[PDB]
């Protein structure tokens, strides 16, 4: 997982969700596109 | 009565099958079994590496060879390397799927996987037999023993019993021989390679003392002055002075032939001395092997045919070097270096061995060799080697590695390769080298230093670093 | 995507052909490759049979000139209008053997002089 301040989609399958008051990116295509914070 | 060699991939069943077959019907190096269809013998040590070394000495100590594969985990790279080693020598290959005693019991991928190697089975095209056997279970001894002879269908005459002594050496402990032609009544004077003696001890495989040696049967002789090599040849003489004169003539002729080989067999002397130039390829990855094989499969038609006789992935093991020597071939290492034993065989014999980094370079060189107009001594040189002994990487800039510099001078004005297991991993240039934390810029031979390479930090304990200059 | 101006443009082309066409059939095309459809369109083009694919909701709009109005009950699922321009019938023999070999489409229904068949 990649922790930044500027989280955003990297491809079509990425998905912006908000979980316990934190913005996250979950991607079914590539497990490298996971992101936190931001 | 052929002479069989067992041959296959590691942990597939060779020793198991050999021991079983011997047990059904004290290790010296050879053994023999009598069956109603005819006596058949085997050599103790299996594997191509031992079979081709003696062949590299004109021995031709083989008639038939058998591959053992497994129903599970079938053709593996050393299996196809063995089939290469058997075709290059040239003997019919009789196959046997061993591990049919398992739940994974499908000799269906084996057949159509091994078929794409010119070992096509009978139901496919009719070229080489296939047989399921199982040393653990036992079901398959009969079919294999019948097929070993049914596939021995050359005339198979000669081996005229009453004949002068003529055999080949096997295990030079004291020694053994597996005679081809003649009889070896004990007490007779003998020339065994560059060596002389008389037969006092004539032990058998089981150790029962005898005095008569069969036509194609093994026997361990003891009484000779010492130990010859492992592939030399033995005959009968009568005069000790004759034996010594022949020995010295052999010394001189061998010292001549080594130079003649190291002269004419170079790549530089291709056109002068058809002739079907043989190469022996070794590449770093399978793609750069297949591509360059397909490139050198066709080069020139009416003058010289270039056919690759080897080809594997990894460093230049000494089995590869022995194969190249025996087939009078030219080594080729694309991004792979030689081991120690390969260096030993290379230094003793001739057998041109040249390294490369660009696919195009080998094609260019072979073109100029086939036209006989190639230049000599091109494409860089080795001006220093270092061995990595410790890798420490501080969290400010972590790339430094301790190195013991061996036989050469490593500098900063020359690019480098880093290589593990005699296979290169990276080719760049230096970033830092510093002794006692002080940035000296020239490291001597036999010294020790700390090397760090630019834009690559992955060196490990046990690597090597070569430094080279594109010299022209 | 398509536009409203083109939507009423494509119904005229079906309506223009259907005005003078004599024998028409309806068939599906799911599962058959576009490669295997080049052969069929080659056969029809040699025999003067006009084959086309239109939207179901546009076929009902297009077929209004009292030509094949007895077909508006089977415009469900994919469609392929195959109107016969010469030798009425014609584009039924082509569909007769093509259905057998290719294993696709039930050839829905057919219309001839107001016969649902």
């Amino acid at each position: 997982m990649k922790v930044r301040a500027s989280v955003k989609k990297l491809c079509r399958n990425c998905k912006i969700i908000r979980r316990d008051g934190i913005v996250r990116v979950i991607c079914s295509a590539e497990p490298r596109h996971k992101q936190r914070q931001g | 009565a052929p002479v069989v060699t067992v041959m296959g991939h590691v942990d597939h069943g060779k020793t198991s099958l050999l021991d079983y077959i011997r047990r059904a019907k004290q290790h010296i190096g050879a053994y023999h079994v009598e069956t109603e269809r005819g006596m058949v013998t085997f050599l103790d040590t299996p594997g191509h590496a031992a079979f081709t070394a003696m062949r590299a000495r004109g021995a031709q100590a083989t008639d038939i060879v058998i591959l053992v594969v497994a129903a599970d985990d079938g053709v593996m790279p050393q299996t196809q390397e063995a089939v290469q080693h058997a075709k290059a020598a040239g003997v019919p290959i009789v196959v046997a799927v061993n591990k049919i005693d398992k739940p994974e019991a499908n000799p269906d991928n084996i057949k159509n996987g091994l078929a794409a190697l010119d070992v096509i089975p009978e139901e496919w095209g009719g070229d080489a037999p296939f047989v399921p056997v199982s040393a653990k279970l036992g079901t398959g001894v009969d079919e294999l023993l019948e097929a070993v002879l049914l596939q021995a269908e050359v005339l198979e005459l000669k081996a005229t019993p009453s004949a002068p002594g003529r055999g080949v050496v096997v295990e030079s402990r004291v020694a053994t021989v597996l005679v081809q032609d003649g009889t070896l009544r004990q007490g007779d004077m003998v020339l065994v390679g560059i060596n002389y003696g008389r037969v006092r001890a004539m032990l058998d495989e089981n150790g029962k003392p005898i005095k008569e040696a069969g036509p194609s049967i093994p026997v361990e002789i003891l009484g000779l002055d010492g130990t010859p090599d492992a592939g030399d040849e033995m005959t009968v003489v009568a005069d000790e002075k004759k034996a010594r004169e022949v020995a010295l003539f052999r010394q001189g002729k061998f010292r001549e032939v080594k130079l003649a080989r190291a002269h004419a067999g170079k790549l530089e002397n291709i056109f002068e001395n058809k002739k079907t130039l043989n190469i022996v390829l070794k590449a770093d990855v399978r793609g750069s092997l297949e591509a360059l094989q397909g490139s050198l499969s066709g080069l020139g038609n009416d003058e010289v045919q270039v056919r690759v006789v080897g080809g594997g992935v990894g460093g230049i093991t000494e089995s590869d070097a022995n194969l190249a020597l025996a087939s009078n071939a030219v080594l080729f290492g694309f991004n792979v270096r030689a081991d120690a034993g390969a260096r030993k065989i290379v230094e003793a014999e001739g057998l041109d061995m040249r390294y490369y980094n660009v696919i195009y370079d080998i094609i260019e060189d072979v073109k100029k060799a086939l036209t006989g107009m190639l230049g000599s001594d091109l494409r860089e040189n080795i001006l220093g080697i270092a061995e990595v002994r410790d890798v420490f990487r501080s969290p400010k800039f972590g790339a430094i590695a301790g190195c013991m510099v061996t036989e050469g001078m490593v500098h900063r004005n020359r690019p480098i390769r880093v290589l593990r297991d005699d296979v290169v991993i990276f080719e760049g240039e230096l970033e830092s080298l510093r002794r006692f934390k002080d940035d000296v810029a020239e490291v001597r031979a036999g010294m020790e230093c700390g090397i760090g390479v630019k834009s690559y930090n992955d060196v490990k304990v046990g690597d090597k670093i070569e430094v080279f200059e594109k010299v022209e | 995507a398509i536009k409203l101006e083109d939507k009423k443009a494509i119904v005229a082309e079906v309506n223009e052909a259907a005005k003078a066409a004599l024998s028409a059939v309806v068939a599906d095309a799911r599962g058959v490759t576009v490669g295997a459809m080049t052969g069929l369109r080659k056969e029809a083009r040699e025999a003067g049979v006009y084959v086309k694919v239109v939207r179901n909701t546009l076929l009902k709009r297009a077929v209004e000139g009292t030509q094949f109005d007895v077909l508006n009950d089977v415009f469900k699922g994919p469609t392929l209008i195959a109107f016969s321009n010469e030798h009425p019938g014609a584009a039924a023999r082509i569909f007769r053997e093509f259905a057998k070999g290719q294993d696709k489409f039930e050839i829905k229904a057919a219309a001839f002089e107001g016969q649902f068949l």
Partner: protein, 135 residues
């Protein structure tokens, strides 16, 4: 099954035909004569495609589709290399009389309604080479 592009009558065991000996093992010397059975037809050299349908063991089939419409335009227009940059660096020239035959020798494998359309297929292929088409 397997397909490739070999010359007009040689088809010898060579890097033109490398993986036919690995696809199913296959006696490739058999396929060499079989390809040579239809011989040159246009003298050896002109590349011709194949569709080798492989069955249990090494059953063959053999069609020889056509001769590709790139060597044909180079032949009828002189030079044997097309442009390294179309638009400007024109290389050849043809006429609507040559385009008639080069399509008439591929009326199989063009699936074009009438032959007037089959020409506009070829002229589109010319405009990528560097040739320029005219009367």
């Amino acid at each position: 099954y397997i397909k490739l592009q070999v010359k007009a009558g040689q088809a010898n065991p060579s890097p033109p035909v490398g993986p036919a000996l690995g696809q199913h093992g296959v006696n490739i010397m058999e396929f060499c004569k079989a390809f040579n059975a239809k011989t040159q037809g246009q003298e050896p050299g002109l590349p011709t495609p194949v569709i080798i349908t492989v069955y249990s063991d090494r059953s063959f089939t053999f069609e020889t589709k056509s001769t590709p419409a790139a060597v044909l335009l180079k032949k009828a227009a002189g030079i044997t290399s097309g442009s390294a940059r179309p638009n400007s660096q024109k290389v050849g020239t043809v006429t609507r009389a040559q385009l008639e035959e080069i399509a008439k020798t591929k009326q199989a494998d063009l699936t074009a309604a009438d032959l007037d359309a089959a020409v506009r297929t070829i002229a589109g292929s010319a405009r990528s080479m560097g040739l320029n088409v005219e009367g």
